[PDB]
Each structure stands twice: as structure tokens, then as C-alpha cells.
Amino acid sequence: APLTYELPDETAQLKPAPQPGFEAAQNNCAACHSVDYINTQPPGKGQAFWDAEVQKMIKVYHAPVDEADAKAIADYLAKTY
Amino acid sequence: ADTVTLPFANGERPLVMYPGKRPLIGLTARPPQLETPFSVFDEGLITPNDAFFVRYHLAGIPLEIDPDAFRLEIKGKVGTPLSLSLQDLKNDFPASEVVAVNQCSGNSRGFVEPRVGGGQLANGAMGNARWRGVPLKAVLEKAGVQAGAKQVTFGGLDGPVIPETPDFVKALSIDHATDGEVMLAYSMNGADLPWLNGYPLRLVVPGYYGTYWVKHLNEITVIDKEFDGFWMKTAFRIPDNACACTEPGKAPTATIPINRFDVRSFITNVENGASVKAGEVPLRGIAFDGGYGITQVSVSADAGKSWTNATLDPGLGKYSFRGWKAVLPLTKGDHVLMCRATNARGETQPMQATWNPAGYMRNVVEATRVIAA
Numbered sequence A: 001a002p003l004t005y006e007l008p009d010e011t012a013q014l015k016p017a018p019q020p021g022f023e024a025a026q027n028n029c030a031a032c033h034s035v036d037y038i039n040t041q042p043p044g045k046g047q048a049f050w051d052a053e054v055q056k057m058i059k060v061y062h063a064p065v066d067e068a069d070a071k072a073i074a075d076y077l078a079k080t081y
Numbered sequence B: 001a002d003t004v005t006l007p008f009a010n011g012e013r014p015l016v017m018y019p020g021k022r023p024l025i026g027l028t029a030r031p032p033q034l035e036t037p038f039s040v041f042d043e044g045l046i047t048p049n050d051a052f053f054v055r056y057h058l059a060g061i062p063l064e065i066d067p068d069a070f071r072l073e074i075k076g077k078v079g080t081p082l083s084l085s086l087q088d089l090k091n092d093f094p095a096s097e098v099v100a101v102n103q104c105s106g107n108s109r110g111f112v113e114p115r116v117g118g119g120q121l122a123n124g125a126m127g128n129a130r131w132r133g134v135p136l137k138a139v140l141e142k143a144g145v146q147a148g149a150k151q152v153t154f155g156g157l158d159g160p161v162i163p164e165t166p167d168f169v170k171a172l173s174i175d176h177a178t179d180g181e182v183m184l185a186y187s188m189n190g191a192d193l194p195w196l197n198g199y200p201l202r203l204v205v206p207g208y209y210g211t212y213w214v215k216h217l218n219e220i221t222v223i224d225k226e227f228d229g230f231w232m233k234t235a236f237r238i239p240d241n242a243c244a245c246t247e248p249g250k251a252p253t254a255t256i257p258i259n260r261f262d263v264r265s266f267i268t269n270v271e272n273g274a275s276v277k278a279g280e281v282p283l284r285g286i287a288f289d290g291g292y293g294i295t296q297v298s299v300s301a302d303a304g305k306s307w308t309n310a311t312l313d314p315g316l317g318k319y320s321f322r323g324w325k326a327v328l329p330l331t332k333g334d335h336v337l338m339c340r341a342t343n344a345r346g347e348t349q350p351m352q353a354t355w356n357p358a359g360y361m362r363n364v365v366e367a368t369r370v371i372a373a
């Protein structure tokens, strides 16, 4: 038989917020990687940092995220993290 | 359940248990990225397999491998393409061994000021191990490298979740790849590679940052041009100057691929606020560089006003951690301890931390406040 490796269950979750970008982030930002990537970034970095993170996912890594969702997500992130 | 807090902002992390590993600092789950608790580095010069840090870029890591079916393909500008089994590598080629530090490009990123995006690591994305395998030189010689070859590319079993995301593929110069020290490692600390450390085979690139050390390595291509894959052309770039640094908040004007380690050192037996007994205080730690040899480790107990020469432990090889010990008289009260290493070509550590946009290559003189009583 081949050898195999068992990963523990994934539990990383985004911080809830009333901004619509919370749900957009839940629906768009966990497809390629766990959301701990977001949870562990430096805190209170502000709008320009999160705008750049979101744009990099879309332009560099080809995250299929439309313009309205991209703004909602960046805005949610800059306000919440 | 268990958590720790790293000594920078937003430092909380789960302690997580993976098969074949002790509890480690969980950075990301998909793909797994695991940092080693700093305390491990005081446990001995060789980092145990069950403690060794883990870093991956892409979620599609292999989770089932048949070692009998595994083949390393050698192709491109070679006279004879090769398809090598693990049994072939072990039987048909002489084995080499090297004790070598693997360290992530962004080890210590969490300490960079101002903070930058990326993997928010403390100092635990490094480890030292005794690697055994086949020098890449021997495999390339068997294939027969053609005149005009310029680079060699390296790819593994992992892949992107979404095929448009760039595949993880790295490149070395041909003269580097054939130097005899670059190794196709099938063994780590006398055992088969732990899964997350690249079972069943990985590239080991002594004295170079870990990004080159391609895990689950199955495809080697000799090329007659410079490789312009994303993870060479765009990722892992450093400022093209002596300090590999820019003014905080400024982009470099020109970059080159990250390459050799700079000189680092740590005191391993004390941490911030540790209590020591006033008098002769024993200190110990490690130091390493890109393979030139640690010439000296100086130690201070007055925030760098004055320095005492540490005694270097017997070495395990130029690419290994080098242990050191010093005994310092500490008067009662607070003391800021520092260690600073220099290597055989004059490279050393800066007293003041520098900066670059990616937060690569940190090597500032480490300070540790202790209380003598």
C-alpha cells in the first residue's frame, strides 16, 4: 500500500462583523487557503494594506472576485483586523 | 486547546499536533505552516524531526505517496533523460551527509518594524539537521549536462488548488547545482524525511534560504536560459545592495533573488525577564551563517557597552549551528544581554535592525533583559 498522512480538522474562522464584506470574505477568501492567513496578519494595518492584500489575490493569484466584493472585503478587513 | 503568545502584536497562536510531530506553533492549516517553540533551540545543536518547522506555499500538498512508484525525473538540456527510483538513488550513487541549517527567508518577520505582510513568524522558522542523500552533481553528471546550460529548475508533488495560481518551482545556477554540496536528501536525522519536511525526497541547498529547498522533489530540468517562473521572478526578491535593505516604507529600485544566509546568533538558555543569580552567570546559544565558518561570538551584559569573547563549541560542519558558551559576572540588578557573531569573511550582525518590504533576512543583534539577584 502507499503511505498516507492525516491532517487535523480545519477550525480557522473569520471575525464576524455586521459589514456585508464579512459574508463576502467567508465566500471568497477560504477557497485557496485557510483564513488563519488573514487572522495572523499584523494588527490595525489600515485601509491601504488590506486594499493591497485583496488586489494581490485577484491580480497575482487569480482569485475570482468581482469589483464590488473586492471593495466590501477590503473594507471589512481594514475595519475588523 | 493550548495557545501561546509570540512577543509581537497579534502574537496569539494555537499549539497544534501533527502526526510525527510534537506540539508546535500553528501558523496556517491549509497548507500547514508550523513554527518551532524557541525553547527547542536550547535542547541541543540538532533540531529533532518531531520539532522541525514546516512551511508550504500551496494548499495542494501530497497526502498519499507510494515510495515504490515515486520517480525523480531529470530532463531538459541533458544527454540522457533519467527516471530514478528511490532504490536507484540509494544504491546506484554514493551517499553524502551534511549537518545544515534550513531557515525560512522570512524567519523573524514578526519582529520587523514597521510590520509587513506575509508569514508572521517569531524566530522558530529555522532548524538544523543531519541530511543524507546524493549530491546533485552526481545525478546531473549521469544525465550529462550540455554545454550552454545556465540554470536548473526544481519542482515537487504539491500544486495549486486553482490551476491558474503559479506552480511552486525554483531555480539554481548550473554551477551551483553541480557544486557537490547541493544534495538530493532522502534522509533527515537518520530517518526517512518527515511528511511535512518533504517525504520522500527534497533538495537541500546548504547556506541558502529555505525557499530553494524544494520538498517532495520529483522534477529537475536543466535549461539554457534564466528561469522566469513567478517564485523566482516576482517572489523572494531582496534589495540589490549590501544591506539587502531599504528605508522603512520604501520599495527598492532594483532587486535580486534571495540567496545566502547572513550571520545570526541567539542566547538560548535565557529569555526576557529570566532570573539569574548575581555573580558568574553561565550563558549558551548558537550562531550560523552562509557556510564560511563562525570566527567568534561576542557577548555583552550592558546593552553593548562592552563585550566578552564566548568559547565556541566543537563544530559539526560549516553549515551547522555553531554552539557557544560564556560565563559573565553580572552585578545585582537588570542587565540587557546581547550576542553578536562574525564569520571568516568578516560578515557580522548590525546593532540596529534594518528593513525591507518583504521582511526577509533579519539578523539584528538580539537583546535579552535578565534580572540578576
Ligand code: HEC
Pocket: A025, A028, A029, A030, A031, A032, A033, A037, A038, A041, A053, A054, A056, A057, A061, A062, A063, A064, A065, A073, B056, B057, B058, B117, B118, B119, B162, B165
Ligand atoms: C487562490 C486563487 C486564492 C484565493 C481565492 C485567495 N488567495 Fe490569499 N493567498 C493565495 C496564495 C497563493 C497566498 C500565498 C500563500 C503562501 O503561503 O505564500 C496567499 C496569501 C494570503 C495572505 C498572507 C499575506 C500575503 O502573502 O499576501 C493573506 C492575508 C491573504 N492571502 C488574504 C486573502 C484574502 C483577503 C482573500 C479574498 C479576497 C484571499 N486571500 C483569497 C491565493 C489566494
Ligand code: MSS
Pocket: B052, B053, B054, B055, B056, B057, B058, B102, B103, B104, B105, B106, B155, B156, B157, B158, B168, B196, B197, B198, B209, B210, B211, B212, B213, B214, B215, B216
Ligand atoms: N514543494 C515545495 N517545497 C518547498 C516549499 C513549498 O511550498 N513547496 N516551501 C519552501 C520554503 S519557502 Mo521560506 O524561504 S522556508 C521553505 C522550506 C521549508 O522547509 P520545511 O518545511 O521542511 O521546514 O521548504 C521549501 N520547500
